[PDB]
A paper describes a structure:
Here we describe TriSb92, a highly manufacturable and stable trimeric antibody-mimetic sherpabody targeted against a conserved region of the viral spike glycoprotein. To enhance targeting of the trimeric cell surface spike protein we constructed a multimerized derivative of Sb92 (TriSb92) containing three tandem copies of Sb92 connected by flexible 15-mer Gly-Ser linkers. Cryo-EM and biochemical studies reveal triggering of a conformational shift in the spike trimer as the inhibitory mechanism of TriSb92.
Reconstruction A describes the S-trimer with all three RBDs in the up-conformation decorated with additional density corresponding to bound TriSb92, while reconstruction B describes the S-trimer with all three RBDs in the down-conformation without any additional density indicative of a sherpabody. The placement of RBD and Sb92 models was unambiguous at map resolution of 6.9 Å, and identified the RT-loop of Sb92 as a key mediator of Sb-RBD interactions. Furthermore, apart from just three of the 27 RBD amino acids changes subsequently acquired by SARS-CoV-2 (S375F, T376A and R408S, which are located at the very edge of the TriSb92 epitope), VOCs, including the most recent Omicron subvariants, do not contain mutations involving this binding surface. We postulate that once an RBD of the spike samples the up-conformation (the common one RBD up state), a subunit of TriSb92 binds to the RBD, and the remaining two free TriSb92 subunits readily sequester ensuing up-conformations of the two other RBDs until an all-up conformation is achieved. This model is consistent with our findings that following TriSb92 treatment, the S-trimer presents primarily in an all-up state (~54%) fully engaged with the sherpabody, with smaller populations of mixed up/down and all-down states. However, the all three RBDs up state observed in our cryoEM analysis, performed using a prefusion-stabilized (K986P/V987P mutations) spike ectodomain with an abrogated furin cleavage site and a C-terminal trimerization domain, appears to reflect only the initial stage of this inhibitory conformational change, which in the case of native spike trimer on the viral membrane results in a more fundamental structural reorganization.
Author numbering:
A (entry chain A): 26 to 66, 80 to 141, 155 to 176, 186 to 245, 262 to 517, 520 to 621, 641 to 661
B (entry chain C): 515 to 517, 520 to 612
C (entry chain B): 124 to 141, 155 to 172
D (entry chain B): 955 to 1052
E (entry chain C): 1004 to 1052
F (entry chain D): 1 to 60
The structure:
Amino acid sequence: PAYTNSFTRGVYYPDKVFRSSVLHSTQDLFLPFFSNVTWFHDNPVLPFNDGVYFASTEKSNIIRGWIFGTTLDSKTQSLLIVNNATNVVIKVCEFQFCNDPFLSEFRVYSSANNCTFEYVSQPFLFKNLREFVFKNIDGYFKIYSKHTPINLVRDLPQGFSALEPLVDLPIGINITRFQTLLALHAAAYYVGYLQPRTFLLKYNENGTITDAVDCALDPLSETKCTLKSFTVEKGIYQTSNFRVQPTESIVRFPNITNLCPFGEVFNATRFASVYAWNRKRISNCVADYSVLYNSASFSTFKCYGVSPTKLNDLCFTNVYADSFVIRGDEVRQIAPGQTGKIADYNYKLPDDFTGCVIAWNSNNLDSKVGGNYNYLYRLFRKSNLKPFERDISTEIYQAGSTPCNGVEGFNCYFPLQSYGFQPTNGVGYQPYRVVVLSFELAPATVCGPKKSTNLVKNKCVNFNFNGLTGTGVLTESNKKFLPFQQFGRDIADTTDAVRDPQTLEILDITPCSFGGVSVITPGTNTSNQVAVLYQDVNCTEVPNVFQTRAGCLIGAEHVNNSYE
Amino acid sequence: FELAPATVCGPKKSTNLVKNKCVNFNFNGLTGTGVLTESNKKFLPFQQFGRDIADTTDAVRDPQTLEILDITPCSFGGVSVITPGTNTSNQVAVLY
Amino acid sequence: TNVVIKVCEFQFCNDPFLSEFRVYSSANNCTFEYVS
Amino acid sequence: NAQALNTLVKQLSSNFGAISSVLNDILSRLDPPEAEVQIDRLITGRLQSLQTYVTQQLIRAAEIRASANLAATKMSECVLGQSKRVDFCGKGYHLMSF
Amino acid sequence: LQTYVTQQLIRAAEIRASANLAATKMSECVLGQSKRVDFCGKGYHLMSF
Amino acid sequence: EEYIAVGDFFSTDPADLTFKKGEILLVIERGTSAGDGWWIAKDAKGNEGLVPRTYLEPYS
Ligand SMILES: *[C@@H]1O[C@H](CO)[C@@H](O)[C@H](O)[C@H]1NC(C)=O
Ligand SMILES: *[C@@H]1O[C@H](CO)[C@@H](O)[C@H](O)[C@H]1NC(C)=O
Ligand SMILES: *[C@@H]1O[C@H](CO)[C@@H](O)[C@H](O)[C@H]1NC(C)=O
Ligand SMILES: *[C@@H]1O[C@H](CO)[C@@H](O)[C@H](O)[C@H]1NC(C)=O
Ligand SMILES: *[C@@H]1O[C@H](CO)[C@@H](O)[C@H](O)[C@H]1NC(C)=O
Ligand SMILES: *[C@@H]1O[C@H](CO)[C@@H](O)[C@H](O)[C@H]1NC(C)=O
Ligand SMILES: *[C@@H]1O[C@H](CO)[C@@H](O)[C@H](O)[C@H]1NC(C)=O
Ligand SMILES: *[C@@H]1O[C@H](CO)[C@@H](O)[C@H](O)[C@H]1NC(C)=O
Ligand SMILES: *[C@@H]1O[C@H](CO)[C@@H](O)[C@H](O)[C@H]1NC(C)=O
Ligand SMILES: *[C@@H]1O[C@H](CO)[C@@H](O)[C@H](O)[C@H]1NC(C)=O
Ligand SMILES: *[C@@H]1O[C@H](CO)[C@@H](O)[C@H](O)[C@H]1NC(C)=O
Ligand SMILES: *[C@@H]1O[C@H](CO)[C@@H](O)[C@H](O)[C@H]1NC(C)=O
């Protein structure tokens, strides 16, 4: 809103050092020359954004201070600065916000409770043009000022003005936004911003900054910083380099997800009991765990020693799966370090089990009228079961000392008993279909399907093929690859050709455009115009344009006539 | 006492100065070794020290006196020996 | 017609040969299986 | 000249005491607080390789300049005119050079 | 070792320059007469061995 | 009695907490009557939930 052009103002002494008749380049927060500056003539809140440049118009005294802080409310302490032409008050107290704060004076004072830091100082100072630069770095708040009587009050006068530091304050809290203060009894001021921009400063005999240039504004000023001079002679100078960044970052992988069915172990009609749990080997097949997360059917999908997110990018071999029937009430027994009846005599999970347990209700299929007496379990055992062991035996328990000779008695206690799963059983007694997956680390582990991002051509695009990755432009290739190659290296171990196995079509790979940018000038005093030269780059993506055998240059017109 | 930036401590030592002698100096923040002498250059009221080329400090304004002084490294270099030959003679002349 | 890869527990034979599949001494406790 | 550029490329593949010869792997599977340790031994090795190439390049540049000056001298005498000095341009009494 | 090779090259280069100069003196001042003045011995050079 | 988790466990169940290696937790009463082999412990945010008994080890 009502932007204005800051021609040259926005410079300050970067430090308290003295330099005489020497040009020094400093990297610090600065306001770029000819940068748009917000103008208000009206007093809304403005963000800080790591440095604020302020400039008040002449013939005015409405501005009397600024308020800095993070929230300017009762939550966080905020910095308050007020000047009454005779003293400056610096409060870091707990002050509330105001709809339209102003000054009759001292109206901005909302709340002074819980004052943390207190500081008081003396005031600093056709009429004077006030310029101020405010920054907060390393917990120190620095104040700069300079009054220059000038004309053309409507806009910012041209010329030069070096801002000097006055006060250092150790505030130490983060500041994100501020608010100017006006006295009601409309003034015009400009608000700028600073960023880590590099300038070159010129020091005279008296060590006063008389002029400066920006190192990223225009090619002419680009050369000055690297040459450490203001008057670059007639010639060609290389100032910096350039390249092209990746855009899409595609990835290609093998025709995939075709392998490894799990319905035969997850959705099979028949499952074994807990006393006869099966252990089928699962290896060298591509398992997709994502579909399990959104199944919306599991009830005890718990992972031990692994997280659902991190088991896809990395995976382990030895994917033995155990399937058995467990009643709802005793599902919790199946866990590492968990003991009980089923966990002790039927299926014991060893400690540090890097796997997950998946269970879901099976009322509609794993139940029948009159009781499903088809699933059995081991109720008694002489000794605790070793973890990951299946004990298929008809030996009966020995409660007392009298041996049992196969005839059941008062101390034989035939361990094998059949479960009862009626359709009307309670939720706790419902038979929940449960499977267990174990993972441990044989080489060549097999994981889930990859990204398969769609490709792109004739663009500097990052690529991460199977095992190999790089950044370069992808284009068609006339070369022929034998059926047992995935990529090719031109010379000196440099990949230049990769065949995407999905499409089965060899493609050339080349690094995208880069090199050193050069500036052509006829002399600082002779003229001002300059031309930018790019070396060995197809002149279609660099930014009068003329293409030459040494790349294309901008700022010159081709002439058929030949001169010296 | 607990740890806002810019902590403030006990008063500084502020010892006296010496001129025209290779002497270590430790001002408020900066320190070094060199000869201190009067200077003709004038500092603006907001500088503390000055450097000329390649980050070489040469002028320091002592806060205690508010006066500007020149700083130069004291004499050093290579010492050479002049001889006319071991057999020709024995006396030698030192060269600085 | 096919190639069978057994990493199973196979015993040694005095003169293994193939009528075929005569070399099959023991396939108990199969660890890894692969067919191509 | 070709091998001097060529030999530089292989230096990128040199480990220089690091577990990997590529920057991406170092930035991926190393803890950043200690990742720079492997980088530092790699930058020094790569910097050393570049130093040799430039220094070696300068040696040849001086040799070429000496050859160029000699070629210019032969241009000055044995092309632009007749070289009275003996055995300076072709064995025997010199007449001219093309 | 880096310094030794680099120093050796510098010495090798100037020796080669000296060798070329020596070869030049052979061509003019030995195989013939050097009309150019003060190139081989002070005074009007006749010949050399 | 502070307890340290030796590894990372994932929980789907709304009754349960998320912990990682090095996390500090406070032990609660041993009234394990809701389910066998289930322990309750507090987390950094204070939320309470059932966690595996073997997921924790006695500190020393
Ligand atoms: C500055 O603002 C004017 C008007 O809003 C606009 O035309 C111009 O493009 C802006 N320039 C920059 C560099 O923001
Ligand atoms: C003041 O604010 C601090 C913020 O940390 C708080 O600890 C303290 O209790 C407060 N005291 C009063 C009197 O509001
Ligand atoms: C400022 O922000 C940083 C960024 O994380 C934070 O660490 C610090 O605690 C913040 N300090 C204040 C006073 O807001
Ligand atoms: C330096 O200051 C002196 C007096 O303070 C003045 O006479 C002289 O003109 C000034 N020179 C420059 C280049 O500012
Ligand atoms: C099993 O069937 C359910 C219901 O159709 C389905 O959501 C799930 O993906 C299936 N799982 C497998 C491994 O077939
Ligand atoms: C696999 O090849 C078929 C054959 O045309 C193709 O339709 C399909 O898109 C390919 N799949 C992938 C993932 O590339
Ligand atoms: C620019 O400076 C050069 C160098 O002194 C001089 O030869 C030339 O005439 C000057 N041109 C103008 C327009 O001042
Ligand atoms: C630059 O690229 C365009 C295609 O974008 C091509 O037509 C043109 O021939 C290229 N120029 C050179 C010099 O290769
Ligand atoms: C210069 O040469 C180009 C190429 O032949 C031709 O098209 C053009 O008409 C000529 N004249 C000018 C003024 O460019
Ligand atoms: C310090 O300031 C006082 C102020 O009166 C002055 O008298 C004294 O001379 C000053 N110290 C020095 C070393 O000049
Ligand atoms: C010293 O030795 C040198 C070298 O042999 C010789 O020229 C000179 O005459 C000698 N002087 C005396 C006094 O022996
Ligand atoms: C099969 O061999 C493994 C080898 O570790 C052994 O642990 C297991 O008990 C064996 N099982 C049978 C039935 O032979």
